[PDB]
Amino acid sequence: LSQDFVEALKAVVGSPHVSTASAVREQHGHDESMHRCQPPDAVVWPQNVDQVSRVASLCYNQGVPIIPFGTGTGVEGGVCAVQGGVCINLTHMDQITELNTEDFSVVVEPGVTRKALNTHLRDSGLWFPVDPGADASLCGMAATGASGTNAVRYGTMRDNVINLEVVLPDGRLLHTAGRGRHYRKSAAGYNLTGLFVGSEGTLGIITSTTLRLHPAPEATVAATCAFPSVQAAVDSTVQILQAAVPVARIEFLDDVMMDACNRHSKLNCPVAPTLFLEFHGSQQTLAEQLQRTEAITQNGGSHFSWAAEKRNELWAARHNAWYAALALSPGSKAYSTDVCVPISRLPEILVETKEEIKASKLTGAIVGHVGDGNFHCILLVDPDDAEEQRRVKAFAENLGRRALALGGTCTGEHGIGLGKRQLLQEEVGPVGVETMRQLKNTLDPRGLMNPGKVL
Numbered sequence: 070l071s072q073d074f075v076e077a078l079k080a081v082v083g084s085p086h087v088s089t090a091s092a093v094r095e096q097h098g099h100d101e102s103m104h105r106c107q108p109p110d111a112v113v114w115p116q117n118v119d120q121v122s123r124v125a126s127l128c129y130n131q132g133v134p135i136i137p138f139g140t141g142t143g144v145e146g147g148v149c150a151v152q153g154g155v156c157i158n159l160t161h162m163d164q165i166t167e168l169n170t171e172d173f174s175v176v177v178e179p180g181v182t183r184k185a186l187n188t189h190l191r192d193s194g195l196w197f198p199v200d201p202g203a204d205a206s207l208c209g210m211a212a213t214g215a216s217g218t219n220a221v222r223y224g225t226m227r228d229n230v231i232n233l234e235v236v237l238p239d240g241r242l243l244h245t246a247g248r249g250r251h252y253r254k255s256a257a258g259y260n261l262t263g264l265f266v267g268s269e270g271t272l273g274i275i276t277s278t279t280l281r282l283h284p285a286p287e288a289t290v291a292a293t294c295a296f297p298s299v300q301a302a303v304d305s306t307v308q309i310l311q312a313a314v315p316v317a318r319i320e321f322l323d324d325v326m327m328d329a330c331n332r333h334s335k336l337n338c339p340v341a342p343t344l345f346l347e348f349h350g351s352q353q354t355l356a357e358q359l360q361r362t363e364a365i366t367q368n369g370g371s372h373f374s375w376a377a378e379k380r381n382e383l384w385a386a387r388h389n390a391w392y393a394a395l396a397l398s399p400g401s402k403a404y405s406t407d408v409c410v411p412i413s414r415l416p417e418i419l420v421e422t423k424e425e426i427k428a429s430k431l432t433g434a435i436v437g438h439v440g441d442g443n444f445h446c447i448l449l450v451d452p453d454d455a456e457e458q459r460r461v462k463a464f465a466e467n468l469g470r471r472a473l474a475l476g477g478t479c480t481g482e483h484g485i486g487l488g489k490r491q492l493l494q495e496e497v498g499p500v501g502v503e504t505m506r507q508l509k510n511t512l513d514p515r516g517l518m519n520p521g522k523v524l
């Protein structure tokens with residue numbers, strides 16, 4: 070990367086906001102995944118959207134790849150600079166604007182995390198529900214199409230993103246639904262917002278997101294329920310969803326995951342396949358949700374172990390399951406699967422996955438958003454054992470292909486990044502791949518917007 074180019078970047082954002090130091094580049098060359106760190110050639114922190122546009126235009130016209138970088142919590146290698154280039158760290162734009170409580174909407178810049186937003190919203194009666202375990206950038210969550218434990222009731226990012234401000238690869242500024250607009254529904258033109266949700270930084274740079282807010286629940290009850298088998302836990306889940314109980318949270322942990330979270334968070338749940346449950350409503354709405362849910366679990370479920378601080382540590386432990394699993398083998402890294410299947414096929418694929426981890430020499434923990442038909446197999450990898458890392462990728466492929474055989478998808482929320490590109494090709498077939506690539510080509514003709522990812 071030439072000295073004239075660096076000085077051009079510094080002219081846009083300021084000398085302190087451009088770095089070519091190896092240490093700073095290495096810190097931005099990886100996320101939380103096991104994907105080998107590939108450092109960008111520079112890191113740049115734009116201070117406003119005009120600077121984002123001007124950095125993108127500079128890179129694009131000089132043939133330099135651009136890698137958007139939020140909080141670096143992705144798990145599929147999205148920020149790895151496989152072709153070098155300029156990593157654009159967006160987190161200095163960190164303002165919340167246009168809070169419209171009467172309309173249930175708010176606009177956030179990329180440095181705003183979910184915690185920051187919900188802190189800003191205390192005593193408003195509103196909250197933002199989509200809750201990845203990591204303290205992630207909300208614009209990064211829009212870019213990956215994130216979900217979380219609350220999505221079974223309150224929806225994913227795709228359900229809760231109303232508008233996006235996007236700097237296209239050549240620097241043009243697009244407001245996907247129109248500048249300043251926010252509304253409940255529209256048939257106006259083609260829906261551009263949905264195209265950029267889940268685009269993983271390959272179609273442009275999200276510089277603000279307009280989010281749907283929700284009313285805080287009148288009352289909340291959380292509980293855990295221990296089961297004699299994985300089959301019993303997932304059968305309960307399927308029957309709870311088919312009975313149309315509007316559960317707020319329904320999270321599965323197998324016995325390996327439960328033990329790991331016990332040891333990492335000083336919980337003391339019985340070591341067993343377990344459901345973490347949460348219910349929202351009034352006292353009366355809660356009583357019959359609990360009535361009907363506990364009748365279904367009583368598939369051999371234990372009496373509910375009920376859980377302010379007490380449910381807070383329960384869901385903090387769930388949110389840290391990734392780190393709980395890594396703590397089972399210090400020094401190792403991890404890869405997560407993320408399949409999502411039609412709910413009636415969930416029992417057979419979790420039970421099969423449990424059996425396959427057991428028959429394997431790999432250490433694997435199972436956790437996830439089974440209310441969506443989605444779950445994660447967290448597989449540990451020694452960063453120096455190439456042969457374990459191949460057993461893990463092979464396990465991951467086979468699980469992905471089994472989900473596709475059942476009519477499902479290879480990723481419910483994490484995205485494709487570097488690790489699921491071949492699965493995506495199988496998932497949508499030749500016409501789907503070409504159509505996706507034609508969209509990529511019209512927005513990013515030179516292929517400089519996060520190259521090597523998704524397609």
Ligand SMILES: Cc1cc2nc3c(=O)[nH]c(=O)nc-3n(C[C@H](O)[C@H](O)[C@H](O)COP(=O)(O)OP(=O)(O)OC[C@H]3O[C@@H](n4cnc5c(N)ncnc54)[C@H](O)[C@@H]3O)c2cc1C
Nearest residue numbers: 139140141142143147201202209210212215216270275482
């Ligand atoms: C402990 C833990 C728990 C997690 N739990 C969940 C979970 O429940 N659900 C879930 O969905 N994910 C989960 N994740 C994954 C991760 O938090 C999400 O994928 C999150 O949305 C990533 O946001 P980020 O800004 O940290 O991404 P980054 O790693 O910074 O980037 C991710 C990808 O998005 C692109 N990108 C980032 N910001 C932008 C932007 N502003 N514009 C355009 N492209 C951009 C990057 O180029 C990259 O390809 C978890 C991760 C961890 C470590």
Ligand SMILES: CCCC(=O)C(=O)O
Nearest residue numbers: 144202390391405445
């Ligand atoms: C990062 C994999 C774990 C995850 O997504 C979760 O905690 O739900």
Ligand SMILES: [Mn+2]
Nearest residue numbers: 216217438482
């Ligand atoms: Mn998850």
